[PDB]
């Protein structure tokens, strides 16, 4: 067609009871650059070549409901250097409620859990957040 897609209809599968979230970020892939030059090159700028890869962490937010303490449980699964690891899948849906773009995350485990702030005059809900480390990510469109 000739029309783009929006970002207000998605889904996350993380091994919990609720698939709804308010914010999803940190989807990025990067590669390093190596520079090189020899003495007699008629070119005075350096040459470039691919190096190692690097992935960023994942940050997700959600509102707080009564009777739901999954973030703390997963974080507290930690032992000296061991922890439960999970496969994380994030999808993008259309108007028939089917997927369109999929991000696949291998061997995720949480590194930070942040609770809410309390203000007396605050007319806002209670927001908790988590940060996730993971080895590698993939992108599937179509």
């Amino acid at each position: 067609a000739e029309y783009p897609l929006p970002k207000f209809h998605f889904q996350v599968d993380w091994g919990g009871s609720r698939l709804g979230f308010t914010e999803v970020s940190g989807l990025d892939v990067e590669t390093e650059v190596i520079e090189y030059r020899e003495g007699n090159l008629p070119q005075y700028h350096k040459l470039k070549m691919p190096g190692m890869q690097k992935f960023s962490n994942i940050t997700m937010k959600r509102g707080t409901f009564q009777g739901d303490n999954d973030f703390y449980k997963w974080w507290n699964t930690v032992a000296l250097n061991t922890i439960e690891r999970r496969d994380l899948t994030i999808s993008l849906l259309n108007e028939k409620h089917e997927p369109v773009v999929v991000w696949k995350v291998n061997r995720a485990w949480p590194t930070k859990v942040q609770s809410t702030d309390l203000k007396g005059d605050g007319n806002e809900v209670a927001i908790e957040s988590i940060e996730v480390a993971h080895e590698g990510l993939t992108i599937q469109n179509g």
Binding site: E35, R37, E38, G39, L41, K46
Partner: protein
């Protein structure tokens, strides 16, 4: 009576030699150092005197003189040095080192301090590293031996 001290970055070097005193490129240097003298002594202990020992003068030592420039591809001075180094043929020279200032009474450039350096001859010659990945200038450095230096009072 002095209130402000002199500045170090306005200076000159003169070769009182074969015919090098009239060559303009032979007076322009990026750096000059090595102008220092030291007295070497020995220690003698006297029995019965436990409060101090005697320090006795022995000899005098001088530092080598070091000059640094950007590389000059055709230099009479370097011909003199390489004649000394390759053919073991040395001919010592005299030098002047000047520290300059502005005098006015309009203004003029004049010497402020002058040292005479007696019987200099080549000691060392070097050029900096060539590196394909750095922004740098080819810099040559010369080191000289001499007998002594004096103030032109």
């Amino acid at each position: 009576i002095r209130t402000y001290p002199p500045v170090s970055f306005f200076f000159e070097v003169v070769f009182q030699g074969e015919n090098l005193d009239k060559d303009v490129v032979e007076t322009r240097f990026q750096s000059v150092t090595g102008l220092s003298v030291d007295m070497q002594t020995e220690t003698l202990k006297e029995g019965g005197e436990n409060r101090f020992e005697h320090i006795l003068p022995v000899r005098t030592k001088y530092d080598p003189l070091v000059l640094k420039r950007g590389l000059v591809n055709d230099s009479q001075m370097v011909k003199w040095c390489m004649d000394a180094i390759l053919n073991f043929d040395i001919r010592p020279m005299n030098l002047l080192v000047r520290l300059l200032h502005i005098e006015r009474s309009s203004s003029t450039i004049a010497p402020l301090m002058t040292w005479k350096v007696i019987n200099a001859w080549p000691k060392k010659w070097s050029v900096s590293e060539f590196n394909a990945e750095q922004n740098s200038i080819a810099v040559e450095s010369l080191e000289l031996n001499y007998s002594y230096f004096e103030t032109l009072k």
